[PDB]
Ligand binder design. Structure first.
Ligand SMILES: OC[C@H]1O[C@@H](O[C@H]2[C@H](O)[C@@H](O)[C@H](O)O[C@@H]2CO)[C@H](O)[C@@H](O)[C@@H]1O
Ligand SMILES: OC[C@H]1O[C@@H](O[C@H]2[C@H](O)[C@@H](O)[C@H](O)O[C@@H]2CO)[C@H](O)[C@@H](O)[C@@H]1O
Ligand SMILES: OC[C@H]1O[C@@H](O)[C@H](O)[C@@H](O)[C@@H]1O
Ligand SMILES: OC[C@H]1O[C@@H](O)[C@H](O)[C@@H](O)[C@@H]1O
Ligand SMILES: [Ca+2]
Lengths: 739, 742
């Protein structure tokens, strides 16, 4: 009895309403433990009207709910239990944007593995993750959930995430089904405003935005979630071209199912697509399989079928897909597969898990500036820790951490005191609130992620910090955003550090003491003034439940920072969108020659971002020899070997991310000045040299041309290697086809 | 006839002579007195020059044309072109400013006068109008266009072509127009000039193309390509664009295509290949004339010998250039536009300046007028303060290459004239343009300098404050310099320069009522100014008559009647923000900012500061309820929509009544509203008039997902008011007629 036979047999037993019921993923409402079977959701499950549920927590609650299905519904079809497990379950790793800066695919996969272990131990068998939306717009709150602006890096991370979640077998009780989102183009919302209109050409979609989604699918992701945005004037959720012709294009078949985003079907009414029945039929016809919360499928599909607006086959295909996911997950052989109390008791938020998170977090930090050897700090003397983010636990996990043990996180103050012990004195001061305008603080600290609010006049509180700082040999400024300043529906028209904090920072600098800016953020910020005036800048994103410890490992040099930016840091928001893989234009500005009239440039700011893609410093220094190519004249399907000597020429052991970029000089369409095509993170002891090697083939040269044909064209290419997208060793080559 | 004449001419022509017609080189300096031995002379004699541009003075142009007529083998005369953008010697407001008149008659007149002056000076071809839609205030070239709306843009494009070209090309008072820049130029990424452009086909057709199309339908003689790529192919080499779109219908276009300045050569930089390759690409795409770069002149013959182009491609391009010259009357009289007497009497005349002054005053947009600050009483004392208070050469704005910049009327000048003996005007610099001198320098190129005060800003501010304290009202002339906009004048910051904001603050702090007369070439972020300044008059850049026109507004000689053609954002973080937007699936209900999980920001409302079509008056206008002839229509019927407008204020005035239509449901998402009509009407104080609009299914059509141009049966909302924001509305139902389905 293989899957297809079993599933066909089952569906032959089902009524029309039961098939439709499988397509329903409703909101659950409150469920009183001890009386699940008589709760609001119970009746629906009993009537076969529920295919799955989500964001229900605890194996105890889940088992009982699952028992209603197994024992009290006619066919005893078990439910899927999903959740947003985004960057950890109870143990929280850094936010995804932070994790992507590790450029370490092993660590990425590992964090996903541990998340799956924890979530599955607590009854969850399906996560709405990874989010792989490409974005070039820092205003958008959701950049925190993604992996930056690059399709290659993004695609690599997609594979790592899906593999971590899903393992080699869906039926394993430590593996959960992943869900790539949000298909598609969500990250191009106009003016960085969440949910706003998206528009772009087909050729831009294929080269610049689609690749990460495709990587997830090729990796075997089990499901796909639709996006809130329209494309070509049709909401993704109702977009047949996208959901059928692209997603399920013959060769490269996606086998899983498509679930809508939260009431995305109903929102098509607001989009302007028609009434609930109309937009529901549109969604099903497009290839949508499961309806999240809005119940458009449940309440309208029969009427449409009776009216011949949809077919039985359409309903059947969607039903079968849901049932197949359940079968693959092991639910028809054991509906309680993911419900073991002892696993939940022993495998969640363990000391070992927290240790791994701590180690992973330290490798996500990006050191953006370190003048005059300020870092690492000596573990002696006195250290002043100042800022609205110095001593707060609940913000450390950042946004999208619904299952995290927020109140058990390690504050920076806590982590610092511990690491220092009796070797160094740690002094503390609030310094300032998150921002002037209390109402902004409030909407930025939703979901219980509150900060201590100081009712005293800002000058009073600053004077307090300055006077404390004057007693220290070095100041550590913990500034930046709060957790919920990014995330969903957290768009900012201003991407600077809040004025109040900058005013505070100014006061700290004026003490004359060395200041280290420890920066908390869920997005790229505009930091020109900070870069000019602060000796050392460490971007720690949001590091998770172990933030305080991981950050202290960095500060004292237990761990040498090795992160690299996966997204461009602009000089101001007026530069947006600014990104490394751009076209040359017909009037490029020669490097270093800002400003030039009649070139492509601004009157009031240079063209360069502040920090480019791939940027990141170390406590040590890395020296690149000259790029060596095995050939500069290639023919057909040959392999080019590119190699380079890398030397740790600094004072500390450390790792660096070696990056490979390729520029296609001439094409039938304009080609980007460069695109990432490989990378390698390597650790080097002080004074050690290693040969780093990349192997290139024509596959690395391919792109989607004007007719959307994926292929490469003969001609000249530039091969580049270095420690960021700007500082590169390069060499030109000629690559020819052959008859 | 023309066809027989040109065919015969072309039969006499050598390959090189045909190629030469396609050349539009830079001229280099031509010493008046020895044009026939100048640098450009030899090339003309050899038949290598199809035309020239930016040569000025009928005297010079006459002697250059003589070279072609008397000293070339076939005597084929030249076109003479120029950027006549908003007036020749008499400067009208910058285009964006002109757009705010919402007066198509006035607009056509300004073009008419501009053609009269240019043609009188030997010019027979203008690189105008630029009709690029833009939703990005950062782009300095918004100043050259007409805002963010396709319908208003299309109406203006039509009015401009009509004004220039008149009834017949061969009139010595008509010149050939050139709609630019085809296409999509105004969507350059991050508002940085020349930067990458990218969008969907369906957005192109509904949102960006219409103005270009109206130019063509109005009979524009030529089209200029743009610098941006499209779908990864530079416009100048984009065959789909230049041939499939531009020349889709039978005899739709029929004119010729010229490249932008070295746009072919720049395709090399784009990454499309070498000069020959990109030249051949351009010719195949449908480009006919090569501006400055000489890629056509130097490479076409080789490409032809190599089979990369065809003879017929060269012949077709050459043919179009000759037809242009034929239509313009050049083969009948190569000197037609070369009359010394016309040039002496018909240019920068008192009459022309008067008209410019009239038009300018109609282009101003009154953004705020609290507590009846405006209009000013012509009595007591008035303090004029700001870096734009007393400067002539900036008044004409950018793209005013033929303007009499130095003869422009400064604001101090106009005000003192108007005040006469009735009020005393007091002046003070207040501050420089910006705290950054190198920014000032680069923002005041092309000779448009501002006098620089080397004293400490605080000393100068105090100087102005002490003057202000002597006045009963203060007039602050602040904003941009002329060349802070225009080409390659992109700004990442769209506020009034910080130094000036600081000055402004010190003025308000005097307790005196302050009027902000704002000089700008772009929308600016003005939330703070709107919050603190009693009155705000946006004067754009009004031309050579700026001071007189502005003074007309200030004292109430002319009741301001302009309305924004582009949205004013609260900050650059909202960009792009525009009125004709999609609803999204999570729209923020009106008045409800902030709402979590709706489409909105944490730190700023969704609303711009001032919406499309916004404009105040010295008086007030009351709208009655919207009357519709029917709520249930079928097939090709006419809906009549009427409304009572009443002047309920204290002054005579005009207001622009705007018609918007919303298509509620569609096979694709439809914008929450679209401008579909307008009428500007003058009303005596207390007068009431019935404004009427005729609506048909044509007004309902759009380009669907498959790019089919059609309307769909269903509900629509008809809206009327003096704002894209404040409207009377009514829903209707419109069905197809089964009988007439074809
Ligand atoms: O001046 C208008 C016209 O100038 C064009 O050429 C520039 C050129 O780019 C620059 O190198 C030189 O120093 O100045 C000349 C003339 O100003 C420019 O390329 C055009 O876009 C511009 O419209
Ligand atoms: O909670 C996450 C989820 O909430 C969704 O519904 C919101 C709803 O918009 C709001 O009115 C209510 O107060 O909170 C609920 C749920 O907390 C929201 O629409 C989703 O996008 C969001 O992911
Ligand atoms: O929680 C389920 C879904 O809720 C939606 O509102 C979010 O946009 C998704 O990212 C999330 O997976
Ligand atoms: O001078 C002719 C052309 O020069 C170009 O550089 C400008 O961008 C065009 O708008 C202008 O018409
Ligand atoms: Ca190539």
């Amino acid at each position: 009895m293989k899957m297809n036979q079993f599933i066909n047999a089952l569906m032959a037993k089902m009524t029309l309403d039961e098939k439709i019921g499988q397509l329903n993923l409703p909101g659950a409402g409150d469920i009183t433990t001890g009386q699940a079977s008589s709760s609001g959701i119970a009746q629906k499950i009993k009537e076969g009207k529920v295919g799955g549920l989500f964001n229900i927590k605890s194996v105890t609650k889940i088992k009982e709910v699952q028992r209603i299905a197994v024992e009290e519904s006619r066919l005893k079809i078990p439910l899927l239990f999903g959740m947003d497990v985004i960057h950890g379950y109870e143990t929280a790793f850094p936010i995804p944007l932070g994790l992507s800066c590790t450029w370490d695919m092993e660590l990425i996969e590992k964090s996903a593995r541990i998340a799956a272990i924890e979530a599955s131990a607590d009854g969850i068998c399906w996560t709405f993750s990874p989010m792989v939306d490409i974005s070039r717009d820092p205003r958008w709150g959701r950049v925190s959930e993604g992996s930056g602006e690059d399709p290659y890096l993004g695609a690599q991370i997609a594979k790592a995430m899906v593999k971590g979640y899903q393992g080699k077998d869906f039926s394993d009780n430590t593996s959960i089904m992943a869900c790539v989102k949000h298909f598609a183009l969500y990250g191009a919302g106009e003016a960085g405003r969440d949910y706003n209109t998206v528009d772009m050409s087909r050729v831009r979609m294929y080269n610049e935005y689609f690749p990460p989604y495709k990587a997830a699918v090729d990796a075997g992701v089990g499901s796909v979630m639709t996006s809130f945005n329209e494309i070509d004037g049709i909401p993704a959720t109702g977009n047949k071209w996208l959901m059928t012709d692209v997603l399920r294009k013959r060769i490269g078949a996606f086998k899983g199912f498509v679930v809508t985003n939260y009431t995305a079907i109903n929102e098509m009414i607001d989009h302007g697509m028609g009434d609930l029945q109309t937009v529901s039929a549109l969604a099903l016809r497009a290839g949508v399989d499961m309806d999240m919360v809005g119940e458009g499928f449940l309440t309208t599909l029969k009427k449409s079928l009776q009216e011949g607006k949809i077919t039985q086959a359409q309903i059947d295909a969607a039903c079968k897909r849901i049932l197949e996911a359940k079968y693959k997950l092991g639910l028809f052989s054991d509906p309680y597969k993911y419900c073991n109390e002892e696993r939940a008791r022993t495998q969640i938020f363990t000391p070992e898990h927290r240790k791994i998170a701590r180690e992973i977090a330290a490798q996500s930090f990006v050191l953006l500036k370190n003048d005059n050897n300020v870092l690492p700090l000596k573990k002696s003397g006195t250290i002043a820790l100042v800022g609205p983010l110095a001593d707060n636990r609940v913000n450390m996990p950042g946004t999208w951490s619904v299952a995290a043990k927020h109140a058990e996180s390690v504050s920076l103050l806590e982590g610092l005191k511990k690491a220092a012990g009796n070797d160094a004195r740690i002094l503390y001061a609030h310094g300032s609130n998150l921002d002037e305008d209390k109402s902004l603080i409030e909407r930025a600290t939703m979901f219980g992620k509150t900060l201590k609010y100081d009712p005293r006049p800002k000058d009073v509180v600053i004077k307090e910090a300055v006077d404390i700082a004057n007693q220290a040999d070095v100041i550590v400024a913990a500034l930046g955003e709060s957790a919920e300043m990014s995330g969903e529906a957290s768009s900012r028209s201003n991407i600077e550090i809040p004025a109040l904090q900058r005013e505070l920072l100014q006061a700290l600098l004026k003490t004359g003491k060395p200041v280290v800016l420890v920066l908390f953020t869920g997005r790229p910020l505009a930091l020109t003034w900070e870069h000019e005036n602060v000796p050392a800048i460490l971007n720690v994103w949001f590091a998770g439940t172990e933030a305080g410890d991981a950050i202290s490992d960095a500060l004292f040099g237990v761990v040498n920072p090795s992160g690299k930016l996966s997204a461009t840091f602009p000089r101001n928001v007026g530069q947006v969108p600014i990104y490394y893989n751009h076209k040359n234009t017909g009037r490029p500005l020669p490097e270093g020659q800002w400003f030039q009239k009649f070139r492509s440039n601004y009157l009031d700011v240079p063209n360069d971002p502040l920090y480019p893609f791939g940027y990141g410093l170390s406590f040590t220094k890395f020296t690149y020899g000259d790029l060596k190519l095995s050939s500069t004249n290639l023919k057909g399907n040959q392999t080019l070997t590119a190699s380079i000597e890398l030397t740790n020429s600094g004072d500390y052991d450390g790792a660096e991310v070696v990056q490979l970029y390729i520029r296609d000089l001439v094409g039938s369409t304009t080609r980007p000045v460069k695109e990432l095509k490989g990378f390698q993170k390597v650790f080097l002891k002080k004074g050690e040299t290693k040969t780093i090697t990349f192997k290139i083939t024509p596959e690395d040269l391919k792109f989607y041309n004007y007719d959307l044909k994926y292929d490469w064209e003969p001609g000249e290419f530039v091969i580049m290697v270095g420690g960021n997208s700007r500082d590169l060793k390069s060499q030109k080559i000629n690559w020819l086809k052959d008859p």
